[PDB]
From Swiss-Prot, chain B:
Residues 1-215 form the BetaCoV S1-NTD domain. Glycans are attached at residues 35, 85, 106, 164, 195. This is Spike protein S1. Binds to host ACE2. RBD also interacts with the N-linked glycan on 'Asn-90' of ACE2. Cleavage of S generates a polybasic C-terminal sequence on S1 that binds to host Neuropilin-1 (NRP1) and Neuropilin-2 (NRP2) receptors. Interacts with host integrin alpha-5/beta-1 (ITGA5:ITGB1) and with ACE2 in complex with integrin alpha-5/beta-1 (ITGA5:ITGB1). May interact via cytoplasmic c-terminus with M protein. May interact (via N-terminus) with host bilirubin and biliverdin, thereby preventing antibody binding to the SARS-CoV-2 spike NTD via an allosteric mechanism. Attaches the virion to the cell membrane by interacting with host receptor, initiating the infection. The major receptor is host ACE2. When S2/S2' has been cleaved, binding to the receptor triggers direct fusion at the cell membrane. When S2/S2' has not been cleaved, binding to the receptor results in internalization of the virus by endocytosis using host TFRC and GRM2 and leading to fusion of the virion membrane with the host endosomal membrane. Alternatively, may use NRP1/NRP2 and integrin as entry receptors. Changing residue 118 to S: In strain: Gamma/P.1. Changing residue 101 to Y: In strain: Gamma/P.1. Disulfide bonds join 94-107, 204-214. The gene is S. Changing residue 118 to K: Partial loss of biliverdin affinity. Residues 193-214 are annotated as: Putative superantigen. The chain holds residues 27 to 302 of 1273 of the full protein.
């Protein structure tokens, strides 16, 4: 259980990077490329939070 | 005449290569152990298309020759016709009906490019037509129903047509049996090996055990 | 299993033999030591996100 | 540590080292300039409610025409910024070029209710793309009314979004069966606004092109005007594959792609393997920056 | 494991390797066998196991 919990928490932390958190995309560079700096910052603030 | 599909109809849902991973997806799939309709070769009655059609054919040598898709099939609107030939394969969307009964002897789009088991999946997304195929033969011990096993269907044809389809009909060779099933929105668990080939799948809504597997 | 001890005013039970038992007790002492780089995890190879 | 004095021990240090980047661009090598003049400079536009859609597949979409010419009014783009459209790539582009009354040009938006918003310009909830309009006083305004455009109304039923259809049958506003014959509360579908140059500025006709893009980074046949440079490997470089930007070392990979497969994705659904759009070789992406080192000091 | 290393998530090794933990358990076993409880209170005093 000590091995499995420490593996499972790291797997969850890795898999959580595909989430959008209400933004348009989970890919960081796509928001920068598809939007200008007025709304790219407010879209990536959700990802950072 | 009804028969039972046996863990068949799983296609590649995207172009993304994934290696040695279990991936859960939400798409129009043929449900596991569903009830499919089975026809003999004499007949080709006209059948509805719904949200998607899984087609299968067990045939001797090129008994099935093509397909007809449409809505009214009365030479007023577009009807997608696929005819495969030993020379070359023809796909057209011509509106006009040519034969009184369809058999083997200003269109907006044209494209020219029991020993045999063939599986196909035809579906439309916003009028965009996707055709997935698989061609693996069976040599001996043909039981005249769906063979028990698993295989993955690779994408072949993408047509940017925008053509509404509601009903369809197949084409037979003239001078064997075929299977039709319908796709439903399902969540599937897919297994990818080191090659990237889909080797196993789990239908999440089939039974509580597979729901536990998906959880 | 239900047992009934034969209690009495003048009655004792004294063992006439023994046995030597060896049991196993298992105790975790430590776990996996992890470390997280914050910039490489959150943004990752992106200067303007940093 | 945000301190000038460091105590004795081992410390994990975040990287303050500056790594310069070299931009590498890679795009499909199609040389055909896109015929936007077939959409714009045509003599007569298409029928408004017939939903005649123009398909753009093999093109170099140069938007300098869209930005450096006088007749352009609005650039209402949803899901993408118009100012960065020349840097990306698209799979298939679709154009709906019809003529609307100017006061109804504001009705071309998803989630709106109107005669234009419900029957021909019904954008879905997940619509991406741009709406462009300009004036048509010189071409689409005629003396005693222009009859080249016909419009459909007088129905309480709304059609499906992005389903091309023709309704030649009479819109049955009344309960009595019209059966293609005008009668009580039976209105013919096609109606002419009869555009004139003597009308108001809002009532003057406007030429409107709705461009729908597919913003996926799939095998793309439409790209903006940009060169393609040499593929630098085994070094920390930027990369731009079909509009897909990234930073990292591109190396040779042994992941045997299926012939229809374009991208490889990791456990975290991040892009790990790519396919070159020209040479059709498979490249592995390794992160550039080392995350941090340990400093052992007294 | 390589995906976590690419994402800023590293795992540090322990300070004491398993050979050294085995040497500690060997020392404790040898002291318990050859000296009883006397090595826990100070210097080890040899005594027969009987
Ligand atoms: C307290 O309890 C202990 C045991 O916990 C008793 O001590 C003796 O313990 C030894 C083993 O620890 C016993 O020895 C064994 O005796 C067997 C005799 O079995 C034969 O006889 C009985 C009775 O007649 C028959 O029912 C049976 O079928 C047999 O015919 C031997 O067969 C055993 O030999 C095996 O093991 C030895 C190794 O020990 C091998 O070398 C042999 O080849 C063979 O495989 C074994 O020798 C012994 O029986 C116990 N003593 C008694 C009297 O039972 C204490 O006696 C007890 N104290 C009190 C006060 O109760
Ligand atoms: C595709 O075409 C069919 C028929 O051409 C359409 O079905 C019609 O739908 C209307 C509205 O519900 C009905 O009043 C008609 O009776 C239907 N016709 C038939 C023959 O059933 C269908 O709506 C079109 N679109 C889709 C997405 O299937
Ligand atoms: C399929 O349907 C038929 C009747 O339509 C029924 O008799 C048969 O049991 C069904 N098969 C399955 C597997 O449910
Ligand atoms: C093709 O010609 C027929 C014959 O008049 C016509 O009804 C139909 O609308 C035409 N289709 C196209 C797409 O031009
Ligand atoms: C993957 O393909 C290789 C050939 O390139 C083959 O040797 C290997 O066995 C395949 N993997 C599996 C799990 O079959
Ligand atoms: C023990 O002695 C007391 C006093 O005579 C008596 O009441 C009790 O029942 C006795 N207990 C037993 C178990 O005999
Ligand atoms: C142009 O593209 C084709 C196919 O995409 C490729 O085979 C060829 O090498 C490319 N040429 C250059 C100069 O990039």
């Amino acid at each position: 259980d000590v091995v499995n919990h420490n593996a499972q928490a790291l797997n969850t932390l890795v898999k959580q990077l595909s989430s959008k958190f209400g933004a348009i995309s989970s890919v960081l560079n796509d928001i920068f490329s598809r939007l200008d700096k007025v709304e790219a910052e407010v879209q990536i603030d959700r990802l950072i939070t | 005449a009804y028969t039972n599909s046996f863990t068949r109809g799983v296609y590649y849902p995207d172009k993304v290569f994934r290696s040695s991973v279990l991936h859960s997806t939400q798409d129009l799939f043929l449900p596991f152990f569903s009830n499919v309709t089975w026809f003999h070769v004499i007949d080709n009655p006209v059948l509805p298309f719904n949200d998607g059609v899984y087609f299968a054919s067990i045939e001797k040598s090129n008994i099935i020759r093509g397909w007809i898709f449409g809505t009214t099939l009365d030479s007023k609107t577009q009807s997608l016709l696929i005819v495969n030939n030993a020379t070359n394969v023809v796909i057209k969307v011509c509106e006009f009906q040519f034969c009184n009964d369809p058999f083997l002897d200003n269109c907006t789009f044209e494209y020219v490019s029991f020993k045999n088991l063939r599986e196909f999946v035809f579906k439309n997304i916003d009028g965009y037509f996707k055709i997935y195929s698989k061609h693996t033969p069976i040599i001996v011990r043909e039981p005249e129903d769906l063979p028990q096993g698993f295989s993955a269907l690779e994408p072949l044809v993408d047509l940017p047509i925008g053509i509404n389809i509601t009903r369809f009909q197949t084409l037979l060779a003239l001078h064997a049996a075929y299977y039709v099933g319908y796709l439903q929105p399902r969540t599937f668990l897919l297994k990818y090996n080191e090659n990237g080939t889909i080797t196993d799948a789990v239908d999440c809504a089939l039974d509580p055990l597979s729901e536990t597997k998906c959880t | 299993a239900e047992n009934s001890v034969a209690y009495s005013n003048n009655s004792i039970a004294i063992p006439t033999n023994f046995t030597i038992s060896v049991t196993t007790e298992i105790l975790p002492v430590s776990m996996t030591k992890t470390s997280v780089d914050c910039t490489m995890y959150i943004c990752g190879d992106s200067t303007e996100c940093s | 540590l945000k301190s000038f004095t460091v105590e004795k021990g081992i410390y994990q240090t975040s990287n303050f080292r500056v790594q310069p980047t070299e931009s590498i661009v890679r795009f499909p090598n199609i040389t055909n300039l896109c015929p936007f003049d077939e959409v714009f400079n045509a003599t007569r536009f298409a029928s408004v409610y017939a939903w005649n859609r123009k398909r753009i597949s093999n093109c170099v979409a140069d938007y300098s025409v869209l930005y450096n010419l006088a007749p352009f009014f609005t650039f209402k783009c949803y899901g993408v910024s118009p100012t960065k459209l020349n840097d990306l790539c698209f799979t298939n582009v679709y154009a709906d070029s019809f003529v609307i009354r100017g006061d109804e040009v504001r009705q071309i938006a998803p989630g709106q209710t109107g005669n234009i918003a419900d029957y021909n310009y019904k954008l879905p909830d997940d619509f991406t793309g741009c709406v462009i309009a300009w004036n048509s006083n010189k071409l689409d305004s005629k003396v005693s009314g222009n009859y080249n455009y016909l419009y459909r109304l007088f129905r309480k039923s709304n059609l499906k979004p992005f389903e091309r259809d023709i309704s030649t049958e009479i819109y049955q506003a009344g309960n009595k069966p019209c059966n293609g014959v005008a009668g009580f509360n039976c209105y013919f579908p096609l109606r002419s606004y009869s555009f004139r140059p003597t009308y108001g500025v809002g009532h003057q006709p406007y030429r409107v092109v709705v461009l729908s893009f597919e913003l996926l980074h799939a095998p793309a046949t439409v790209c903006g005007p940009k060169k393609s440079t040499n593929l630098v490997k085994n070094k920390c470089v930027n990369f731009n594959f079909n509009g897909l930007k990234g930073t990292g070392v591109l190396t040779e990979s042994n992941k045997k792609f299926l012939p229809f497969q374009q991208f490889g994705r990791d456990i975290a659904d991040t892009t790990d393997a790519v396919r070159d759009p020209q040479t059709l070789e498979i490249l592995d992406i390794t992160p550039c920056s080392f995350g941090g080192v340990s400093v052992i000091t007294p | 494991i390589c995906a976590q290393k690419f994402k800023g998530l590293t795992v540090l090794p322990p300070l004491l390797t398993d050979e050294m933990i085995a040497q500690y358990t060997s020392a404790l076993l040898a002291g318990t066998i050859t000296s009883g409880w006397t090595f826990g209170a100070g210097a080890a005093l040899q005594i027969p196991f009987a």
